[PDB]
RNA sequence: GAAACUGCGAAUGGCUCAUUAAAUCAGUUAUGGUUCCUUUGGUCGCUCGACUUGGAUAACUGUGGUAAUUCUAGAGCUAAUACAUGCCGACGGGCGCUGACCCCCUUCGCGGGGGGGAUGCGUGCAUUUAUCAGUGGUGACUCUAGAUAACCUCGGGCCGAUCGCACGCCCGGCGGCGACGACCCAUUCGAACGUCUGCCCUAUCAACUUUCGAUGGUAGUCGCCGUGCCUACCAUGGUGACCACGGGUGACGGGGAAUCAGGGUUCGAUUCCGGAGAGGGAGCCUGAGAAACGGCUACCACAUCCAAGGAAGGCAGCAGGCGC
């Protein structure tokens, strides 16, 4: 059907090839997955050798990684902002590999607070009134507190990250082919990558 | 071709089988196994053509379905099972044991061995490997995977394995000054002492071999088998002892034995 | 079988590593030989 | 200077967001006695298809032509000359076969007429299968 | 209950086609009005619609509720069970057996 | 032991040469850029949380349809290595975080140094992603192993609800040969797409290719994988008198054949290897492998049987008939 072959298109010299055989199967080709954002929907494609290949047609969750301290959590994709290849893949917000998405910052914040015993986001004059957040931020023995005061030293977050946390949504880049593995796994944008992409989103936006 | 091929025509059959033309159209396409299609000896060929125990492929079928023939200490009820190099074929009811090692010419000789020698075989290691728990792995020339080997054995050595346990006893390192039988190319069956190895990064490394009588010949490294340390082979050899004398010498020896018979 | 193969390898390997370590101290013996023969 | 294309250009193996308180570079010697040149180690360019600072393995053939054209993007046309031998007339005939070959920005200045050594790699584009590995400046070319 | 008969050309009424005419379906394995010869085989079959109408030749009817009166033909007798349970659990289930 | 369900095979073999001129094909190399039924060998109490489960169907029994075919509808009965669903084990812990609390020695005292350790969460291989370290190997890995933080497709990876012979070994105790099956690994059989060089006549074919892919760059999509294969945005390129582009072949390629002093010329549909096709094109199901035609679905050409509503086609298989 959808042919994936070299013999259908002109030689290096601009001379036409006359096809010496009809379409073979291994010269295969199938329609594009076109993965949207919605409730989990995955169809299975049986491929050469009797192996499987999962078509994610809708996805909500995704395994994203805060790379600077090896904090990976399953979060909830909310929307797409910028795609490098094509900008109709933004309009009809398709999930493809290496597209910029926004994710829920809540599992990263929860880990950050429970690891450093310091607040992240939570704007000045934050009423922490359930006060089991204050349990996670206070009430230790002696030597355990020494370990936690030792560690809070190197919890200096990049201001670019700290804004996104306080807004409540982080930028991430999809590192897995979602149309072939049925997964929207990626990494949270940081440093020079983040400054590059934040310029690109603002510039395009206007 | 829309899939794997199952018929092998008699003219396409490997030449070392010495199959006659006017018998049929086909030869026995060897069933998949440890050795390659091209370089094996199918059990029907060895049993019917070489030994002359059977006359037809149906007679060979009638033998091999009584569990008589044992290849490498396991019963093989497949008449086109590929029996290749170094393989040990023990028939119990007759009380006879054969090791398939090459004639001095490019074919398999029918070399009888003793009950005590038909208990092991030499395997050329093909690739060393680490498994899924830092467990080291060997792969041999006859498709055997041996795990937890000796930590010195490397990619071109020879190992002596036992045909009950399938475990490594002793091994011969691939060095200069070690006996090697040549198991591929023009020099097929030539025994000699390794003189040199010539390294070519990206290409096939050629290895110089010295025969007993000062005959020097090269072969690609792949087609060499270290069968002994020094001049001492760890197996028994056919009559000739892998020299491959010239055609003028073979004539002289033939008509010497002829005229002596008279 | 898994247990006995692991135990027999541990013996043979540890012996081969003792051989290499006897060589390791000859490596340092070659260092000090180049230092003061 | 770099990152002209819409997607962020990085050597994808090296990680550049290690918390602290120069950028590192990934490269390799590509075997067969080729000196991984100085610009590979001390450049700040990004290339998928550089044999030194990229994901291509050199294996198979090592051929050599003269640089003919340098008018396409990180690619050049070399011209390979040989003598084909006709059998009837016990003489030769001068033939040629010019191939599109991938030039890394590693080799900073090559001039049309320079001698190139090329290593076979996987198919890089429609017609590109070879990589420039060392350049030998044409007869003299000092001034 | 209308178990579904045939057309007057023998084209049997396939379930859930929801028409009163005759139409063409591409029937695979696991369908009615068809069985494949080779594995993975499909076939165009002319089948009569589901909607029972005037121009049939048969109607398969199954007696859902036995009525007030008794028929001479059917109800009078009762055919025996050819076979019974072959599986051990089905024997224990039918005849009500303890475990020991 | 017929029938039927299940499993496998039907992709080989055979036939013909219409296509096809760097295509096919031949030698030579690459997969460190892939998939692989079968075979042979590894693996299969590595995982810390039932002395055998479930509801359908065939053959069978019976009731039928239309003129017709290897068409099949309806009812009642029953199986599994079909189709589903699932324990118990070994199994007591081990390792990694968490961490009540605890005792110890020093500073009179804070602080300090190391020790034990409740509760909780995690764990195996494969799979997807991110980070750290540098047992075995290569000419060269972004290799193989190892370590940490998560994932796990409900159209769902594994972690035996299977069958046959021999019957045994002590107080209702107590195990060997095989058959079959399986995620992963190597191996065998291959296949696939690439590398270098090589082909007949033609100038009354000198310029050709491209904004609907022509040559390159970046990021995707798709595929078993590498790639303009195809999307989007960029760049102006690629080939040519060393014959490109176009046209012709009574052209499938080669091993080979006839003829020959030495050179050569002509042939090679034809039994071996490789390719392509099944009336002409196109599209697909099943399977490890098919764009299969002694598979299915259309249209074009032809054409058989009709109770006129419909049913069924494919000899360049072996024979054989017409036409030529």
UniProtKB/Swiss-Prot annotation, chain A:
Sorted UniProt keywords: Acetylation, Cytoplasm, Isopeptide bond, Lipoprotein, Membrane, Myristate, Nucleus, Phosphoprotein, Ribonucleoprotein, Ribosomal protein, Ubl conjugation
Modified residues (Phosphoserine): 159
Residues spanning the signal sequence: none
Compositionally biased residues, Basic residues: 7-25
Any coiled-coil regions, as ranges: none
InterPro entries: Ribosomal_eS8 (IPR001047), Ribosomal_eS8_CS (IPR018283), Ribosomal_protein_eS8_euk (IPR042563), Ribosomal_Se8/biogenesis_NSA2 (IPR022309)
Residue location of crosslink Glycyl lysine isopeptide (Lys-Gly) (interchain with G-Cter in SUMO2): 169, 192
Cystine crosslinks: none
Membrane topology note: Lipid-anchor
Gene Ontology terms describing biological process: translation
Chief location: cytoplasm
Lipidation residue positions, type N-myristoyl glycine: 1
PTM-bearing positions, type Phosphothreonine: 129
GO cellular component: cytosolic ribosome; membrane; nucleolus; ribonucleoprotein complex
Region of interest (Disordered), ranges: 1-26
Compartment(s): Cytoplasm; Membrane; Nucleus, Nucleolus
Sample GO molecular function, one term: structural constituent of ribosome
Entry-annotated residues carrying N6-acetyllysine: 36, 127
NCBIfam families: eS8 (TIGR00307)
PANTHER family per UniProt: 40S RIBOSOMAL PROTEIN S8 (PTHR10394)
Record note on quaternary structure: Component of the small ribosomal subunit. Identified in a IGF2BP1-dependent mRNP granule complex containing untranslated mRNAs. Part of the small subunit (SSU) processome, composed of more than 70 proteins and the RNA chaperone small nucleolar RNA (snoRNA) U3.
Family under the similarity heading: Belongs to the eukaryotic ribosomal protein eS8 family.
Protein name per its UniProtKB record: Small ribosomal subunit protein eS8
Native species: Oryctolagus cuniculus
Lineage of source species: Eukaryota, Metazoa, Chordata, Craniata, Vertebrata
Gene name of the encoded protein: RPS8
UniProtKB/Swiss-Prot annotation, chain B:
Residues modified as N6-acetyllysine: 232
Primary subcellular site in the record, as a coarse category: cytoplasm
PROSITE patterns: RIBOSOMAL_S4E, S4
Keywords of the record: Acetylation, Cytoplasm, Isopeptide bond, Nucleus, Ribonucleoprotein, Ribosomal protein, RNA-binding, rRNA-binding, Ubl conjugation
Any Gene Ontology biological process: translation
Superkingdom of source: Eukaryota
Record-linked SMART domains: S4
Gene Ontology MF term list: rRNA binding; structural constituent of ribosome
GO cellular component: cytosolic ribosome; cytosolic small ribosomal subunit; nucleolus
Family to which the UniProt record says this protein belongs: Belongs to the eukaryotic ribosomal protein eS4 family.
Free-text function comment from the UniProt entry: Component of the small ribosomal subunit. The ribosome is a large ribonucleoprotein complex responsible for the synthesis of proteins in the cell. Part of the small subunit (SSU) processome, first precursor of the small eukaryotic ribosomal subunit. During the assembly of the SSU processome in the nucleolus, many ribosome biogenesis factors, an RNA chaperone and ribosomal proteins associate with the nascent pre-rRNA and work in concert to generate RNA folding, modifications, rearrangements and cleavage as well as targeted degradation of pre-ribosomal RNA by the RNA exosome.
Listed name of the protein: Small ribosomal subunit protein eS4
Species in which this protein is naturally found: Oryctolagus cuniculus
Swiss-Prot record, chain C:
PTM annotation: Ribosomal protein S6 is the major substrate of protein kinases in eukaryote ribosomes. The phosphorylation is stimulated by growth factors, tumor promoting agents, and mitogens. It is dephosphorylated at growth arrest. Phosphorylated at Ser-35 and Ser-36 by RPS6KA1 and RPS6KA3; phosphorylation at these sites facilitates the assembly of the pre-initiation complex.
Basic and acidic residues: bias regions: 17-29
Gene: RPS6
Region annotation Disordered: where it falls in the sequence: 17-37
Function: Component of the 40S small ribosomal subunit. Plays an important role in controlling cell growth and proliferation through the selective translation of particular classes of mRNA. Part of the small subunit (SSU) processome, first precursor of the small eukaryotic ribosomal subunit.
Modified residues (Phosphoserine): 35-36
Subunit structure: Component of the small ribosomal subunit. Part of the small subunit (SSU) processome, composed of more than 70 proteins and the RNA chaperone small nucleolar RNA (snoRNA) U3.
Organism of origin: Oryctolagus cuniculus (Rabbit)
Family to which this protein belongs: Belongs to the eukaryotic ribosomal protein eS6 family.
Subcellular location: Cytoplasm; Nucleus, Nucleolus
Modified residues (N6-acetyllysine): 11
Name the UniProt record assigns to this protein: Small ribosomal subunit protein eS6
Curated annotation (Swiss-Prot), chain D:
Keywords: Acetylation, Citrullination, Cytoplasm, Lipoprotein, Methylation, Nucleus, Palmitate, Phosphoprotein, Ribonucleoprotein, Ribosomal protein, RNA-binding, rRNA-binding
Gene Ontology cellular component annotations, sorted alphabetically: cytosolic ribosome; cytosolic small ribosomal subunit; nucleolus
Residues annotated with Phosphoserine modification: 57, 100
Pfam families per UniProt: Ribosomal_S17, Ribosomal_S17_N
InterPro entries, A to Z: NA-bd_OB-fold, Ribosomal_uS17, Ribosomal_uS17_arc/euk, Ribosomal_uS17_CS, Ribosomal_uS17_N
Matches recorded under CDD domains: Ribosomal_uS17
Cellular location(s): Cytoplasm; Nucleus, Nucleolus
Residues linked to a lipid group, S-palmitoyl cysteine type: 50
Modified residues (Omega-N-methylarginine): 59
PROSITE patterns registered for this protein in UniProt: RIBOSOMAL_S17
Post-translational modification: Citrullinated by PADI4.
Residue positions, PTM Citrulline: 20
Residues with N6-acetyllysine modification: 28, 35, 48
Subcellular location, principal: cytoplasm
KW Nucleotide-binding (keyword) present: no
Any GO BP annotation: translation
NCBIfam families recorded: PRK08572.1, uS17_arch
Job description of the protein: Component of the small ribosomal subunit. The ribosome is a large ribonucleoprotein complex responsible for the synthesis of proteins in the cell. Part of the small subunit (SSU) processome, first precursor of the small eukaryotic ribosomal subunit. During the assembly of the SSU processome in the nucleolus, many ribosome biogenesis factors, an RNA chaperone and ribosomal proteins associate with the nascent pre-rRNA and work in concert to generate RNA folding, modifications, rearrangements and cleavage as well as targeted degradation of pre-ribosomal RNA by the RNA exosome.
Similarity section: Belongs to the universal ribosomal protein uS17 family.
Protein name in the entry: Small ribosomal subunit protein uS17
Species per Swiss-Prot/TrEMBL record: Oryctolagus cuniculus
């Amino acid at each position: 059907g959808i042919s994936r072959d070299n013999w259908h298109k002109r030689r290096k010299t601009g001379g036409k090839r006359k096809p010496y055989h009809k379409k073979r199967k291994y010269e295969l080709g199938r329609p594009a997955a076109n993965t949207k954002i919605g409730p989990r929907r995955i169809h299975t494609v049986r491929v050469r050798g009797g192996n499987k290949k999962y078509r994610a047609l809708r996805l909500d969750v995704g395994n994203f990684s805060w790379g600077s301290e090896c904090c990976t959590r399953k979060t909830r994709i909310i929307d797409v902002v910028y795609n490098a290849s094509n900008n109709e893949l933004v309009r009809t917000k398709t999930l493809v590999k290496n597209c910029i998405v926004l994710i829920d910052s809540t599992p990263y914040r929860q880990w950050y607070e429970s690891h450093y015993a310091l607040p992240l986001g939570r704007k000045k004059g934050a009423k922490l009134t359930p006060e089991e957040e204050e349990i996670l931020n206070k009430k230790r023995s002696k030597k355990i507190q020494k370990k936690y005061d030792e560690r809070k030293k190197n919890a200096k977050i990049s201001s670019l990250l700290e804004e996104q946390f306080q807004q409540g949504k982080l930028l991430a880049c999809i590192a897995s082919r979602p149309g072939q593995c049925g997964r929207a796994d990626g990494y949270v944008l940081e440093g020079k990558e983040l400054e590059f992409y934040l310029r690109k989103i603002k510039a395009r936006k206007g | 071709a829309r899939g794997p091929k199952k018929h092998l025509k008699r003219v396409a059959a490997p030449k070392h089988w010495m199959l006659d033309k006017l018998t049929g159209v086909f030869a026995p396409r060897p069933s998949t196994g440890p050795h390659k299609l091209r370089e094996c000896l199918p059990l029907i060929i060895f049993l019917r053509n070489k030994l002359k125990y059977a006359l037809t492929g149906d007679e060979v079928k009638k033998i091999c379905m009584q569990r008589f023939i044992k290849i490498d200490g396991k019963v093989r009820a497949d008449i086109t099972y590929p029996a290749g190099f170094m393989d040990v074929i023990s028939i119990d009811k007759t009380g006879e044991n054969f090791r398939l090692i090459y004639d001095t010419k490019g074919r398999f000789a029918v070399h009888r061995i003793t009950p005590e020698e038909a208990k092991y075989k030499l395997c050329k290691v093909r690739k060393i490997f680490v498994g899924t728990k830092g467990i080291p792995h060997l792969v041999t020339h006859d498709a055997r995977t041996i795990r937890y080997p000796d930590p010195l054995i490397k990619v071109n050595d020879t190992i002596q394995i036992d045909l009950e346990t399938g475990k490594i006893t002793d091994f011969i390192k691939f060095d200069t000054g070690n006996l090697c039988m040549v198991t591929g190319g023009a020099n097929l069956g030539r025994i000699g002492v390794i003189t040199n190895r010539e390294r070519h990064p990206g290409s096939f490394d050629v290895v110089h071999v010295k025969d007993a009588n000062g005959n020097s010949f090269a072969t690609r490294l792949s087609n060499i088998f270290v069968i002994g340390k020094g001049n001492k082979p760890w197996i028994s050899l056919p009559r000739g002892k892998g020299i491959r004398l010239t055609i003028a010498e073979e004539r002289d020896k033939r008509l010497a034995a002829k005229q002596s018979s008279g | 079988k898994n247990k006995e193969e692991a135990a027999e390898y541990a013996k043979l390997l540890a012996k081969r590593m003792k051989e290499a370590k006897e060589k390791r101290q000859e490596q340092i013996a070659k260092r000090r030989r180049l230092s003061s023969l | 200077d770099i990152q002209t294309e819409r997607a962020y250009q990085k050597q994808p193996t090296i990680f550049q967001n290690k918390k602290r308180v120069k950028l590192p570079r990934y490269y390799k010697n590509i075997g067969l006695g080729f000196k991984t040149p100085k610009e590979a180690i001390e450049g700040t360019y990004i290339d998928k298809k550089c044999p030194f600072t990229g994901n291509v393995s050199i294996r198979g053939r090592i051929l050599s032509g003269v640089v003919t054209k340098m008018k396409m993007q990180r690619t050049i046309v070399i011209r390979r000359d040989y003598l084909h031998y006709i059998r009837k007339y016990n003489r030769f005939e001068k033939r040629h076969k010019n191939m599109s070959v991938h030039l890394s920005p590693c080799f900073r200045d090559v001039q049309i007429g320079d001698i190139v050594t090329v290593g076979e790699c996987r198919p890089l584009s429609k017609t590109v299968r070879f990589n420039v590995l060392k350049v030998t400046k044409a007869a003299g070319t000092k001034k | 209950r209308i178990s579904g008969g045939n057309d007057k050309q023998g084209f049997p009424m396939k379930q859930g086609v929801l028409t009163h005419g005759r139409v063409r379906l591409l029937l695979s394995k696991g369908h009615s009005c068809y069985r494949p010869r080779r594995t993975g085989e499909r076939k165009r079959k002319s089948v009569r619609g589901c909607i029972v109408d005037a121009n049939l030749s048969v109607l398969n009817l199954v007696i859902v509720k036995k009525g007030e009166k008794d028929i001479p033909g059917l109800t009078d007798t009762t055919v025996p069970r050819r076979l019974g349970p072959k599986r051990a659990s089905r024997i224990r289930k039918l005849f009500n057996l303890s475990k020991e």
